[PDB]
Design a protein around this ligand. Structure first.
Ligand SMILES: Nc1nc2c(ncn2[C@H]2C[C@H](O)[C@@H](COP(=O)(O)NP(=O)(O)OP(=O)(O)O)O2)c(=O)[nH]1
Ligand SMILES: [Mg+2]
Ligand SMILES: [Mg+2]
Length: 430
DNA sequence: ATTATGACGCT
DNA sequence: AGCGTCAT
């Protein structure tokens, strides 16, 4: 009733760059613009593995995780850009620097949470309060929302997509009570006005296009962002949640796409997020644990409390390389050489991080995978990181992993190593 | 032989 | 601290 909190206290947006690495390469090379194109890492095995796909190429069925050779079967005119290689491995520096460009623009409008190389959450609650005081009860013109979809509208009592977008927006705006400065729907609308401005600034100052979601929490903002990619933003109101979730497969919600979501489906005998509402909070906790149960009980009603963290910089800086099948490292000299290449990249990135961001990592995490282990990491060991020196970190990494070598022979390495991973963590202000 | 990361929960 | 899960 009057006391049931509805999770409508915040305005949260999620901004995600469209086919980000592709856009970075299309900015640099105009010949790739407005074409089916993809970004690949490496080349010799099956043409390289695709990690980003322009929307024109997606129309042909090209996807992330495809081998380029297979993608070319679906799209013979597909254009390809390769990730830079340095010290024998993929080097993603160009895309990290482009990411910093975007995140610095977003930070002008609000404190952001860097959630990946291409996306950030924004808590717009206070900015919305401010813009509402400025508006002085003045209604919001559809011209301020030129790329916004309102999820669930139009409804009730008309052929092309832009016309449908405008019909839905008109219905939404006419239903608005622009007098109540505390109306959650009005707050979301003003948030969407601000996100239009943020996306305009990103495109004007970088050339990059993005999509966004606007809702009352992070999960709904992320889901909304996906609904109308590319180059559009979507508002998911609290009221839109029952219909949206009534046919939403459980796996589409962030964090339910793996074993937990499968167990929700299997234990409860349900398929859609909306079906979760029929269970009590205690029932869900009994199946999925305290925290998961409370999270599911709230989230199927559109309510989620995870805060937008004030964090524009990544928490860790890491370097990793797989050595699949027959390229796996089987000698001590090989393991040392690749530990050194990874450590040299790490030292470069860490030194630049220290100069830019006034902090120093203090812990070095070494992870390996051995042949025949189906897990990501076969072993993880930490040691101290006291100097940004690649020879030192690579010698320390060897010292912490050398006991994994089954070979009594000192020259060989058995079982051979199919992955090396160095990660700098536990940053302190310097 | 999907790869290269990054986040975060569990014990 | 080291491992597992999720993500893409
Ligand atoms: N190295 C590496 N990079 C990856 C991987 N997967 C993605 N990336 C990189 C390449 C991606 O460009 C970037 C951002 O990932 P998204 O937001 O998930 N995809 P995008 O922005 O391309 O398309 P959309 O319009 O649907 O958002 O992360 C991977 O497995 N490995
Ligand atoms: Mg993206
Ligand atoms: Mg993303």
């Amino acid at each position: 009733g009057p006391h049931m909190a509805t999770g409508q206290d915040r305005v949260v947006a999620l901004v995600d760059m469209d086919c980000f690495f592709v856009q970075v390469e299309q900015r640099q090379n105009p010949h790739l613009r407005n074409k089916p194109c993809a970004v690949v890492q490496y080349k010799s095995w099956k043409g390289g593995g695709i990690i980003a796909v322009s929307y024109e190429a997606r129309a042909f069925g090209v996807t992330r995780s495809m081998w380029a050779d297979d993608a070319k079967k679906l799209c013979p005119d597909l254009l390809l850009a390769q990730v830079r290689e340095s010290r024998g491995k993929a080097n993603l520096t160009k895309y990290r620097e482009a990411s910093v460009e975007v995140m610095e623009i977003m930070s002008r409008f609000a404190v952001i949470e860097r959630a990946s190389i291409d996306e950030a959450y924004v808590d717009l609650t206070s900015a919305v309060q401010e813009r509402l005081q400025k508006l002085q009860g003045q209604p919001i013109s559809a011209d301020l929302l030129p790329s916004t979809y309102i999820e669930g509208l139009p409804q009730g009592p008309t052929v092309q997509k832009e016309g449908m977008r405008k019909q839905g927006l008109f219905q939404w705006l006419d239903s608005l009570q622009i007098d109540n400065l505390t109306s959650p729907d009005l707050q979301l609308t003003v948030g969407a006005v601000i996100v239009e401005e943020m996306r305009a600034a990103i495109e004007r100052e970088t050339g990059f296009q993005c999509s966004a979601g606007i809702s009352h929490n992070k999960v709904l903002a992320k889901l909304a962002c996906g609904l109308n990619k590319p180059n559009r933003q979507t508002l998911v109101s609290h009221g839109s949640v029952p219909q949206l979730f009534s046919q939403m497969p459980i796996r589409k919600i962030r964090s339910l796409g793996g074993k937990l979501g499968a167990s929700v489906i299997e234990i409860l005998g349900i398929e859609y997020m909306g079906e979760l509402t029929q269970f009590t909070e205690s029932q869900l906790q009994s199946h999925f644990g305290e925290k998961n149960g409370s999270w599911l009980y709230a989230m199927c009603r559109g309510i989620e409390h995870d805060p937008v963290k004030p964090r524009q910089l990544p928490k860790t800086i890491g370097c990793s390389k797989n050595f699949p099948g027959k390229t796996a490292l089987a000698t001590r000299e090989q393991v040392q050489w690749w530990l050194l290449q990874l450590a040299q990249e790490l030292e470069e990135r860490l030194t630049k991080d220290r100069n830019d961001n006034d902090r120093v990592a203090t812990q070095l995490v070494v992870s390996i995978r051995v042949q025949g282990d189906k897990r990501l990491s076969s072993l993880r060991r930490c040691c101290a990181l006291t100097r940004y020196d690649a020879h030192k970190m690579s010698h320390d990494a060897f010292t912490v992993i050398k006991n994994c070598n089954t070979s009594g022979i000192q020259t060989e390495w058995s079982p051979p190593l199919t992955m090396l991973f160095l990660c700098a963590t536990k940053f302190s202000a310097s």
